Design a protein around this ligand. Sequence first.
Ligand SMILES: [Mg+2]
Ligand SMILES: [Mg+2]
Ligand SMILES: [Mn+2]
Ligand SMILES: [Mn+2]
Ligand SMILES: [Mn+2]
Ligand SMILES: [Mn+2]
Lengths: 302, 308
Amino acid sequence: GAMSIFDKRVNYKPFEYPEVLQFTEAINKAYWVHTEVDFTADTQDFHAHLSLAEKTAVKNSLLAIAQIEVAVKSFWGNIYEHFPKPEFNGLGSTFAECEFRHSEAYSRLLEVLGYNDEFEKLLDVPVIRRRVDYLSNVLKDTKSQDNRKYMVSLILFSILIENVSLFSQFAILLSFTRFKGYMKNVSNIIAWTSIDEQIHANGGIYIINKIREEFPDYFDEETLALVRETVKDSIAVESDILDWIFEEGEIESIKKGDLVNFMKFRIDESLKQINIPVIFDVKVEDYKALAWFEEEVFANSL
Amino acid sequence: GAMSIFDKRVNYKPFEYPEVLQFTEAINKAYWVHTEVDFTADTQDFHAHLSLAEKTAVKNSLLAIAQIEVAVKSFWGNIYEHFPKPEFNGLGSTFAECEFRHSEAYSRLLEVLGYNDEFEKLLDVPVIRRRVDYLSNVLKDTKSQDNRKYMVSLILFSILIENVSLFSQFAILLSFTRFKGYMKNVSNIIAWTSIDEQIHANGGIYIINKIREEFPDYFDEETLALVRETVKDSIAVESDILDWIFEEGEIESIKKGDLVNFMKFRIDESLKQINIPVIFDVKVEDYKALAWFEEEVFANSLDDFFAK
Ligand SMILES: [Mg+2]
Ligand SMILES: [Mg+2]
Ligand SMILES: [Mn+2]
Ligand SMILES: [Mn+2]
Ligand SMILES: [Mn+2]
Ligand SMILES: [Mn+2]
């Protein structure tokens, strides 16, 4: 059979998948650590200027982010086990190192704002448990030796972990800087993280599309239906998380309904990129509510 | 049994091994890539100003470095499988990413100087085959679940692959910049690599000493004897590699004999740091010859943010 992404190549170069360097180069240019940032102004703003509803939203957003980011994340560091090419060990290790810079950043934020205790007991929160049990279950095949099962796990990983499960919280936190001028340093971290995650998702999409090019029959009706139904179930889970984030009431800078449409639009954009039929078909008026997101990310990255 | 470095800890913090962050922060602060660096003047130096003996010493040194660096290197990225702590997944992943920056840097150098053909046929060189055969023994237990065997693989990996195998070649290349002002940007790459590799070696040493603290009986006479004899055999291989590097004759900027003592000194210093008896006992006047190595590396790494 013809050489494929699953087959070992021994020689370093030429790369069979040279576009890998577009993603590693993007990470290189965006390289950042949290020690570059002082949160004294943000802590003061948090305690002195934010309402109870705003304090709760900020706290629960960061706790939700940390549930994903403050962890040992082995996926990217292991893609070479499935795609045994020098360039994918490179891509994998590059993204793996990023995740440690992320875990350290969000661990510091938890320390600085005084939420280590609440983070430690976060599995007491039922909506978090459901997200964990959802994510555990649907991403079970990230360690499968079966390449078809693994491909599906990569689709879901790229959609859920690198996008759906984070970006609503990123949006919430950036909204405080955009509309109220608060949490500027926290928003620095959030903006840099969102840039990295977008690169991670885009790298995932790249790999998925290469597998599709090489093995079109992996993308049969049964597999497409599994992905779509699994992705649908994320909405319920993440929508309940927003109810918990806003458990002390709605806030001025951002609204839940717009965040739900934001999530749905981002899902559909990812599905189109991998030739899977859209699920939600969000109307322009609805997803434009948070169209400021990209602009604000760019602003707080500088 | 008490919690050890080999036992899984689930919670992220506090770290049981917080000194990990000294190593990751050092790598973070030194972060560099090859992509903004250009070698037009270096290539002109190479062709216009170097004798055949110097050209060949440079070429063969780069080929020897590339033999180790231009490869898929999985060790660091897998230390979490052996030390299942969040901080060691962090250390491992940080050092793993570094190795891809290195492989890309040396792949670029091979291209720029036109050595791709020779690199592809490098196993035709007997001393290189001997090095591969020998490195295969350092790496042989690096996937072992036997923690004593894995520990020995880590010792050999740290003191040979990270702190010695490359350093004679780094010194050769730096000597052209130090003594004649040539090949400045190649020396930038070399110096930045040397800094990273030293951090890798020191991170390995840190781990080895934690294992020694927790499991003193792993360092029994049998184990010490194996390490010391394995390391001795390395010298012979690397000394032969030097004969090949300088096959066209001795050059002005650096001497083979000094490089051998430099290597022996570096080995013994590493062995002392992990409480293993020294092997070579190198004279003060002998290791003084390449005492400049550290300060040249430091000099070539100063204020290079935009270059990096
Ligand atoms: Mg691995
Ligand atoms: Mg074990
Ligand atoms: Mn992340
Ligand atoms: Mn990610
Ligand atoms: Mn290296
Ligand atoms: Mn190294």
